[PDB]
Design a protein around this ligand. Sequence first.
Ligand code: MG
Length: 246
Amino acid sequence: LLPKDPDDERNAFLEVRAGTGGDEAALFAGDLFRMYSRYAEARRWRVEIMSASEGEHGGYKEIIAKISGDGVYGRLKFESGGHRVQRVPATESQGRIHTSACTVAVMPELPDAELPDINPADLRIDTFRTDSAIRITHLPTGIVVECQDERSQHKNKAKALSVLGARIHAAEMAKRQQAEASTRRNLLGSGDRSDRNRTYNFPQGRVTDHRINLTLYRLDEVMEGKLDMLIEPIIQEHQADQLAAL
RNA sequence: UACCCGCAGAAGAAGCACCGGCUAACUCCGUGCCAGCAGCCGCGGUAAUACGGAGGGUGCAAGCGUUAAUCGGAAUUACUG
RNA sequence: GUACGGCCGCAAGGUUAAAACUCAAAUGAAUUGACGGGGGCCCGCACAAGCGGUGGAGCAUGUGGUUUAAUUCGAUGCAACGCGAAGAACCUUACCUGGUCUUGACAUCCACGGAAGUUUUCAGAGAUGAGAAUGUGCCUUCGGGAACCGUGAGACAGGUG
RNA sequence: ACGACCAGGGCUACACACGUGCUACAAUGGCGCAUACAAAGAGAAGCGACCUCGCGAGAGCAAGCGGACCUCAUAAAGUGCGUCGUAGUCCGGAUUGGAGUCUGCAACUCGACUCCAUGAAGUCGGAAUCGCUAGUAAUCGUGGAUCAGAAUGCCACGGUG
RNA sequence: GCGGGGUUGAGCAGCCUGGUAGCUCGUCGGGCUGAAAACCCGAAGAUCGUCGGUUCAAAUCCGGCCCCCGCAACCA
RNA sequence: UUCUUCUAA
Ligand SMILES: [Mg+2]
């Protein structure tokens, strides 16, 4: 009955990087990615890693994936933000609590047909080491998306453009939503993609949201993909933001 | 005018600060190195006497705090010293 | 001991000498320690002297990793790794997949209704579903209870969380 | 329901990586026959002779012994002879087919063992690294617990040295 | 416009008159260390830029192209 | 002869 965001039914391009705190966050970049792998397989969604980058110490410097299926952006759009891990390092033999965090970007599946204002004069495309590596740079936004992991040039080009065109959608629809003042009533959270949304205390096994301040000692389950325990009450409060302003 | 006389009924009249230590005075609940606190040492990194609330208590009192400000403590420019 | 200025110098620079700022310390000796690619001493299959073995092979066994609906969990320098576990076909099993159950398997309390209990048929993977003969061991100025089943009420249980 | 019960699963998966073992790469050996020699334990439905039958795994009889009595119980390395003749071998045994045996509701996952066939790798192992100072190392058997069944493990025990 | 070259990941040898893919580090894995380095040990990886031809056979020889790299774009 | 380093209750 509620007027919904029509990009919710789109799928999700996904962008995870390493964060602050050292290898712990870079591990925690790789640690979170297994959960969404468990989640999207539980959600019967196809995980498609478009590009990946470790810190070569067991932790991912970054990773770009696409998760596709049924209403994938409508379940993952809330996740974009800071997410903190609290644990004890293995090189520490005293129990000094180091803390680290990571950065999340969730974008709708935006086709280039749904991107009419794309312009190759507004693009800068680099081909390097038949050369298979593709670096596409969107000139008015400065958005640079590389793809080199495929064996051929044509496969890397569409993969570097689709994430970039999603980042054009990620830039512009954020710049449309932050411009609209009364539309943010139907919005759970701040609307910026930088809030420390959820803290992971591992010795407590604690999952603690911060936008609704929902605390769970269910981390072992959640890390293995029991995440609709969290995503659904977010939407229940997100649509409570939608219903109470109507 | 001061002042004096009766008049009504407990009637018409109490608060602010603080309680980890220094420093008199504490428990409980929320809270979780967040929110905050803070003169100093310092708290909050789930069991907070230090955060917020409750009660309870301390201390002043029609004020109570805060800040600014000057000397003091400082023999910390030392004549004393 | 720096900036600026003065001073001096052939120059190098010297000399005179700040403040903004920032910290809640800085330092001094001395003490117990620890540590030393310091010194001295002593001891150790520590080295030396010896013997065999591992690492190569195959397999057992364990962990990691990976995988899994699940591969239950713990132990991971020495001092985890044929460890927990002196022995996972089921059981174990703590895990998965379904099937189920809720004063609950169980403790005790509390009534209530059948003495228990005895044999059986069928459904069902089984957890269970009605059939189905009974008994009166116990006791009583005898709810038929207690033993022992079932029902109910909550007290609570339970948890290898 | 992080509680209770049932079946089935899984705890045994599998590119790998490591630990720890076991068995090898042979002639001081292999194989065959003959023969010598323990110690310590275990045992009542037990240990189960004895004989029977089965190539054997076993099956049946069923003594005997709660055990300084009987059973387990024949120690093995060895000794003696024969044989193999320096080879992937009469080394070595992986794997796999077949066919059983036993256990236990039940051996698909997922058992142990027998028989037949099969006969990988392996011809002393890089950098490295381990153990051990005498009955020790080395090497050879035996037993025990755990245990329905099921140990190259663990715990003992002797032999040689 | 003309010359040059395009080679395991990388940077490069060999490119030899065509029967012929080496190096080094990197990588991977062990060893060493309490750990990381360093070092040691062991591993693997190339269709020789491209489209073709000549050839018994092309990295090789040849031709065209892609890429650059050099060079030259003069005299009033 | 040679011989470096150890984030953060
Ligand atoms: Mg090792």
